[PDB]
Structure formats: C-alpha cells, structure tokens
Design an enzyme around this catalytic site. Structure first.
Site, short mmCIF file in Angstrom:
data_model
loop_
_atom_site.label_atom_id
_atom_site.label_comp_id
_atom_site.label_asym_id
_atom_site.label_seq_id
_atom_site.Cartn_x
_atom_site.Cartn_y
_atom_site.Cartn_z
N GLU A 195 0.86 -1.20 0.00
CA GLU A 195 0.00 0.00 0.00
C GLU A 195 0.89 1.24 0.00
OE1 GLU A 195 -3.55 0.39 2.41
OE2 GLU A 195 -3.91 -1.77 2.44
N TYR A 237 -5.87 3.95 -9.28
CA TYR A 237 -5.48 4.30 -7.92
C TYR A 237 -4.40 3.30 -7.52
CZ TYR A 237 -5.79 5.54 -2.98
OH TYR A 237 -5.51 5.95 -1.70
N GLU A 296 -0.44 1.69 -6.41
CA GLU A 296 0.46 1.56 -5.28
C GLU A 296 1.66 0.70 -5.69
OE1 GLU A 296 -2.45 -0.42 -2.63
OE2 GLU A 296 -1.23 -2.23 -2.84
N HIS A 310 -0.57 -8.07 -2.83
CA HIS A 310 -1.65 -7.43 -2.07
C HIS A 310 -2.86 -7.52 -2.99
CE1 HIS A 310 -4.00 -3.56 -1.25
NE2 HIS A 310 -4.24 -4.35 -0.22
N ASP A 352 -0.69 -9.32 2.01
CA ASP A 352 -2.08 -9.09 2.42
C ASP A 352 -3.02 -9.65 1.35
OD1 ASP A 352 -4.40 -8.20 3.78
OD2 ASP A 352 -4.35 -6.25 2.79
N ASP A 384 -3.54 -11.22 6.10
CA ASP A 384 -2.13 -11.36 5.75
C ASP A 384 -1.73 -12.83 5.84
OD1 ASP A 384 -0.52 -8.24 6.28
OD2 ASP A 384 -2.67 -8.59 6.55
N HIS A 410 -3.36 -3.33 9.42
CA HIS A 410 -2.92 -4.72 9.30
C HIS A 410 -1.68 -4.97 10.15
CE1 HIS A 410 -5.49 -6.18 6.00
NE2 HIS A 410 -5.41 -4.96 5.51
#
Ligand code: ATP
Ligand SMILES: *[C@@H]1O[C@H](CO)[C@@H](O[C@@H]2O[C@H](CO)[C@@H](O)[C@H](O)[C@H]2NC(C)=O)[C@H](O)[C@H]1NC(C)=O
Ligand code: CA
Ligand code: CA
Lengths: 372, 258, 125
Positions: B39, B76, B78, B132, B166, B210, B250
């Site tokens: 993230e 969006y 990461e 993720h 995650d 996770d 997390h």
C-alpha cells in the site's frame, strides 16, 4: 535527404531541453534538464542496476535520487552531466544515432569562448557526429518571427535576457541579464500561497504549484488598481483541485506572482524590472537604430506566456520611452519554442548546407574553427 | 533469517513526515532481515527515500531495496517494496508478473517476484512472490497465484518459493465455500503457514488477511515451527488504540527461517 | 561565408532589380515578366542594385512577407536576406516589408504597378 530529413536541432534550457528534426512544427521531445543520481543501492522490479537516470525518469523518481542541474542560469556548468543529457536525447528520446545526423545546438546570449569550443569538442569526439553548428537562442527567436532587426525578450526557467539585434548580428554590448524566471516565480508562488493559509507539504503539492502558476496566473496591468478590484471580493478568484478531492481558491496571489517580473523588490531583489531592462537595453545601442527596436519588440521563452504581458510591457515602455515613439510588443503563441522553431528552419535551409562546420574542418583546425 | 510481509495503510509522504509515527515504522523494519511493505502510495518515492535515510544513516548499506512502478487497473495505484539486508541475503533476479496487460488481466496489481540467495539457511536460493490482493477478486487473484508459481518453475526452475502478503483471504472476502476453487489451497504442493485462526488486523476484528504460503521441500524444512505468526506491535510496545491504528490497520505476518 | 549557391553569384553584379521566392527552404528566381506579382501565401526577397557616382554600387535588401503564408517561409525570408547582406560584405541596408503596408521606396521599384493574388507554394514543414 542525407541532410534534409536527417538534420537535428536542440534548444538547451535551464528548465527544459527541447529537441527534434529539421523541418518539424514542434520539437519531437521536450524533457526537463535533470540528472538524477541514486542515493541508496537498489533496483526496480524487472530492471537491473542503474548508474543514473535522465529526464522524466529522474523527475518521476526524485525522492530516492539526488538531482543535479547541468545548465545553471542558461549556461552549461557541469559538462559530465550535460554529456548524458544529449546521450538520452539522441538514443532514448529521438531513437537516432548521432554519427550520421547533423546536429544544431543553441547557446545562451553571452556564452563564453571556452563554453562554445568545449561543447564543440564534445559532439565531434565523444559522439562522432558528421557535422554541427552553434546558433544563439535569442537570434533564432527573431528569425522565427520572420525578421532581422529588433529586441528579443527570452525568459525561460533559469534566466531572462534582452537581446538587441540589428541586420541579423546580435549586439553583445547592449545585452542585459536578470537572474529570475519560471523556477523563481513558482518558488515565490509557493511562499505567498502558503502565506495565504494553505499548505504544500508533499510532492503532489510541491509539483502542482508549478502547474497552477502556468494555468491560472496572469499579468495584470496597473497593479495598484488591480488590488482594489481584488479587494472588492469580485469574481477574480479561481478554484482548482489537487490530485485528491481537496479544492483550493486562488485570489490576489494569482496576479501578485508574475508582478515580481516588474517589481523585483517583491522577492527582495534590488534590481530593475523587465520594462526597465528593455528600455536600458535599447539605451545601450546606437541612436540611429532605436526606432526599429521599439517597434520590433519580440517575445520568447516560457515565462512570457502569462496573459496580459504584452499589455503590461506596452504601457510601461511607452510611459518610459519618448512620446512620439512607435512601440509594439510582439508575442507569437508558440513563443515557448521560439528558440527551437527558428533553428528548425535555419538548419533545413539549402543555404545552411555550407554553414555546417564538419569533421573535415575539425580534424585540421581543431575545436577553435567554429568560434568565428 | 527474519522475514515479514507488512501492509502499511496509506503509506505516503504525509505518513513518513510524522516524526512520532516514522519512529516506530523504521523500528519495526529493523526487526527483520527481509521486509515486504504494501500500500505504498508514493508517486515520487520521497517517503521510500526518507525511510531509507533513517535506516542507512549510520551504515549506507544497512538495507538495499527492490521497488516496482505503480500498479493498478483501478486508476489508484500503489507499489510493492522490499527492504532486505545485503549481508544476510542477496537478490539474484527480480521480475514483474505478466498476466496479459485487454479484459483477461487476472491481477489488479501484478505480483513482484524476487529471487534471493540466503547462504545462512538450509535453502541457499529461493523465490518470494509478493501480493496485495483486491478484496473483490480476493479469490480470483489467490487462485491465479498457482500460475505465478508455475511460471517460476518455467523461468528459474526453483521449486522453493514463498508467496506472502495481504491476501485479504478470510472473512467476508473469502468465505468457507470459496476455498474449493483456489488451486493454491487445494493442491498439496503448498503449505499455508499463517492459519485461518490467526488475526492479522490491528482492529478488534478477527481476520487472517495477511498470509505466508511456502512451497518446495527444502524451503518448508528451512522454516522454524511456532515462528510463523503475526506481530502485535500495539501490545509489544504498549501502544494505545489510536496510536496503534494511526500506524496501520494490518499486522505484520512474520516467519523465521533456518 | 563560403556560400556557392547559383543565385548568389548572379546577384548584385549589375544595376537592375532581382526577385526570388521562398520555395520550401530554397530560393528560386522569378521570371522577369512576372515581376510585380506576389502570392499572398508566400514570402519573397528582392534586391535593388543602384549605380553610384563614384563607380561603386548600392544594394537595398527588401523582403516582402505574405499575409496567409506560413512561418517557415516568413522566417526563411529573414534568414536569406541576412546571408546576402553578408555576401555583399555588409554593404546593404535591409528593409522589412509587409503586405498592404509597403514602404516609401519599395512601392517605387515597380513601374508597372503592384498586384497581389491568392495562392502560393505549400509549406516545408
Ligand atoms: N504557459 C505558461 N505560463 C507560465 N509559465 C510557463 C508556461 N509554460 C512554461 N512556463 C515556465 O517557463 C519555464 C520553461 O520555459 P523555457 O523552456 O522557455 O525555459 P528554458 O529555456 O528551459 O530555461 P532558460 O531559457 O531560462 O535557460 C518553466 O519553468 C515554466 O514554469
Ligand atoms: C502524528 O500522528 C499522530 C496520530 O494521529 C498524532 O497523535 C495524535 O495527535 C492528535 C492531534 O493531532 C491528538 O488529538 C491525538 O490525541 C493523538 N493521538 C493519540 C491517541 O495519541 C501526532 O500528533 C502526530 N505527530 C506529531 C508530533 O505531530
Ligand atoms: Ca531557452
Ligand atoms: Ca505558402
């Protein structure tokens, strides 16, 4: 065809570095003059090790890099870094080998004897180009507008330069210099806009404040009375949104930013304004040729694009110069490429074919041949 | 050998700028030899640059890094970020997974695979697939990890591979019935270290989002039993509720190899 | 300045009037009978060689610029004019001539009258 469509041109700016072929409308590549050096040891997923980045990659990954600026105030300072900028331009940007492409280069107004010969020495021996030439930035701008006489006002990212020209030849003795441009006004905007109440902490704030300046700012003539307009809470505001969903409102500071060009005391400088520079620039010329300069007042560079700039200059120099004098401020809409545009033409001429100081001239006379 | 996969909520520049928060983030990173952060919403790698400054201030080569470009079809994006100690281990090869990009792009964020070289463990060379997952295709993306591993076999012929991150692989996003289709869980080749029992959420909720999967006989044997579990930093450092949540939502799923 | 273009050698030898049109980054001599005819979408270059009392010559460089022309031709017109002035040892005074707003002397060269017209050669871009 061997030199017509194979010729190349390149403007060397403190901020951006424009490049392209001979006979194009606009330059094919326009990247920032940056050389990013990695601080920590690591790699990007997919890639291997990287000694250094250039251009947008340096810009887009500037957090982990230590960026160096090769062109300080229009003139080349770091030769080792500037060498890589052209390498990136030839291979990475334009996808062309330099050894079979004539290369035209642009130099700032008062570029020292050594600086002309040093870059000449680079292109031929380090890149092995077939032919090259070193034109002036302000001169091409005058030729771009289609004339041979008049005063040019090239204000880019690094510096501002008033360059009187007569019959093609520039007048060095009358050239004026001022160390304030795009990057300074943005840095002033940054401070007056945070002083307004807002905050520009992250890179998304730090980078967008430049985008704001370019799109929203305007040169408001009669600043004294422009405050009374802004003091009446009128619709001279202009809202603008960040990358995220957070909006902002820009008021006075919208026009107080470019006003620094006409009031250097804004940023604490005790120098003269662009209007006075233009007057004094002419005053350092022969008396029999001032009428041409007043009437042929050309504009170039990026930091002249602010709306209401011609209006602002026109009023000032006419208020300062003689009453019966004919003044006219010219500003072509492609003035942020004036330097490149003029060169793109210059290089593509049939008559320019003989101005190329080729490797034949270089091998015998050395780097001193193109000095003139 | 200490490994960890830690999802940091809103890991941007505003996060690292906070001196109070930054303190504990670097502190957590120093606990592990290899660390995988998720993230990472840093458009120009300033926070990533800042984190490296605190870590490598005394010794320039305390931690090396492996980062990817921003990934995300959702507009969006990461980044995946590895922070590994060069002395303890060394990277041999790194590559971004090529699912397709179309319409058939199975992943939201294409997993970043890294080949390591740990000479101080049973397994000398092993892979580490970081991921993720998007909660929507939590199952679809977890199901497609089997192909990622299958591709590692066509590339490096390395059957020892650790697939961690995650996965959002529990509770509402991946319920009981949804494990049937996932070839990762069904096929005996894989060994899920972090159990369904585990709570990898800093919040009061109980979800094993996770995860830390491990394949290959040698790799599985390298693992220390009773080590593969999360890390409650709230109770560890004696933090308050808002203090702990301010960092991230997390927990970091760790594991000790040997 | 070692220019050897066909038109340069013919230029400025004797008294008269010489015209060239900017045709895609190159000069081309206009036919003597078509003098006084200018396409509004092109840029031109003129040179008036006048005889003097001392036996020497006098050169006046004029470049007529079209209204609907392109930037390449307008620019080239300025460039050539400077290269000629230098070819004549800097012994000529250049004159900027716009369409409709011609100078005192420029209008005087054409004893058959000045006549514009729509058209012109395409750009070199
Ligand atoms: N539309 C615009 N309005 C206002 N400012 C602009 C605009 N476009 C560009 N600029 C400013 O001009 C600068 C770039 O212009 P330019 O390319 O002429 O400079 P340069 O040639 O790179 O540097 P210099 O000429 O000073 O050595 C940028 O810093 C930018 O802020
Ligand atoms: C970094 O962020 C933390 C967490 O948000 C800040 O701590 C909180 O500060 C707010 C005011 O900004 C208080 O209302 C809270 O009580 C604090 N959280 C708790 C529960 O301790 C902290 O202020 C920030 N760091 C600094 C020094 O600015
Ligand atoms: Ca410039
Ligand atoms: Ca034309």
């Amino acid at each position: 065809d061997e030199d017509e469509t194979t010729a190349l041109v390149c403007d060397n700016g403190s901020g951006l570095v424009k490049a392209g072929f001979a006979g194009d409308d606009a330059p094919r590549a326009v990247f920032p003059s940056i050389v990013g050096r990695p601080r920590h040891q690591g790699v990007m997923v997919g890639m291997g090790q990287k000694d250094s980045y250039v251009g947008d990659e340096a810009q887009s990954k500037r957090g982990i890099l230590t960026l160096k600026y090769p062109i300080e105030h229009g003139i080349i300072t770091n030769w080792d870094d500037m060498e890589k900028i052209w390498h990136h331009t030839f291979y990475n940007e334009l996808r062309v080998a330099p050894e079979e492409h004539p290369t035209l280069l642009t130099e700032a107004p008062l570029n020292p004897k050594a600086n002309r010969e040093k870059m000449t020495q680079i292109m031929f021996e380090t890149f092995n180009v077939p032919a090259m030439y070193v034109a002036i930035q302000a001169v091409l701008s005058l030729y771009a507008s289609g004339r041979t006489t008049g005063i040019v006002l090239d204000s880019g990212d690094g510096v501002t330069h008033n360059v009187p020209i007569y019959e093609g030849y520039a007048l060095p003795h009358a050239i004026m210099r001022l160390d304030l441009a795009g990057r300074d006004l943005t840095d002033y905007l940054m401070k007056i806009l945070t002083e307004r109440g807002y905050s520009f902490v992250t890179t998304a704030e730090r980078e967008i404040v430049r985008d704001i300046k370019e799109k929203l700012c305007y040169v408001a003539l009669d600043f004294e009375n422009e405050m009374a307009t802004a003091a009446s809470s009128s619709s001279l505001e202009k809202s603008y949104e960040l990358p995220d969903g957070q909006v902002i409102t820009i008021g006075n500071e919208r026009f107080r930013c470019p006003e620094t060009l006409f009031q250097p005391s804004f940023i604490g400088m005790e120098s003269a304004g662009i209007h006075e520079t233009t007057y004094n620039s002419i005053m350092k010329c022969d008396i029999d040729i001032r009428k041409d300069l007043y009437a042929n007042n050309v504009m170039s560079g990026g930091t002249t694009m602010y709306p209401g700039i011609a209006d602002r200059m026109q009023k000032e120099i006419t208020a300062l110069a003689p009453s019966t004098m004919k003044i006219k401020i010219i500003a072509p809409p492609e003035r942020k490429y004036s330097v490149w545009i003029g060169g793109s033409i210059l290089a593509s001429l049939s008559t320019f074919q003989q101005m190329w100081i080729t490797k034949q001239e270089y091998d015998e006379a050395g780097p001193s041949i193109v000095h003139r | 050998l200490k490994i960890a996969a830690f999802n940091i909520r809103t890991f941007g520049e505003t996060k690292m700028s906070n001196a109070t928060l930054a303190s504990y983030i670097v502190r957590i990173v120093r606990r592990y030899d290899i660390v995988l952060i998720q993230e990472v919403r840093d458009s120009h790698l300033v926070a990533v640059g800042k984190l490296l400054d605190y870590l490598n201030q005394d010794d320039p080569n305390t931690y090396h890094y492996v980062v990817s470009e921003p990934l995300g079809r959702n507009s969006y994006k990461e980044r995946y970020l590895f922070l590994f100690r060069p002395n303890k281990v060394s990277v041999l090869d790194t590559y971004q997974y090529d699912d397709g990009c179309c319409g058939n792009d199975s992943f939201s964020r294409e997993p970043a695979v890294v080949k390591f070289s740990s000479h101080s463990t049973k397994v000398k060379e092993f892979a580490i697939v970081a991921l993720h997952s998007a909660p929507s295709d939590a199952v679809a993306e977890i199901n497609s990890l089997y192909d990622v591993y299958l591709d590692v076999q066509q590339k490096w012929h390395l059957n020892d591979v650790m697939l961690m991150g995650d996965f959002n692989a529990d509770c509402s996003y991946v319920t009981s019935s949804q494990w049937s289709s996932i070839r990762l869980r069904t096929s005996s080749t894989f060994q899920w270290l972090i159990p369904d029992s585990a709570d990898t959420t800093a919040t009061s909720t109980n979800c094993a989002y996770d995860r830390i999967v491990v394949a290959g006989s040698l790799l599985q044997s390298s693992v220390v039993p009773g080590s593969a579990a999360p890390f409650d930093f709230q109770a560890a450092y004696g933090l308050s509720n808002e203090m702990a949540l301010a960092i991230s939502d997390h927990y970091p799923v760790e594991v000790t190899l040997t | 300045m070692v220019v050897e273009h066909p038109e340069f050698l013919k230029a400025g030898k004797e008294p008269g009037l010489q015209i060239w049109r900017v045709e895609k980054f190159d000069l081309v001599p206009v036919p003597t009978n078509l003098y006084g005819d200018f396409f509004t979408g092109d840029a031109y270059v003129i040179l008036k060689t006048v005889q003097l009392r001392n036996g020497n010559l006098q050169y006046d460089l004029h470049y007529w610029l079209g209204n609907e022309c392109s930037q390449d031709e307008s620019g080239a017109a300025a460039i050539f004019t400077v290269q000629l002035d230098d070819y004549l040892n800097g012994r000529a005074v250049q004159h900027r001539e716009v369409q409709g707003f011609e100078s005192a002397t420029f209008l005087g060269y054409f004893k058959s009258g000045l006549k514009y017209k729509k058209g012109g050669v395409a750009s070199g871009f």
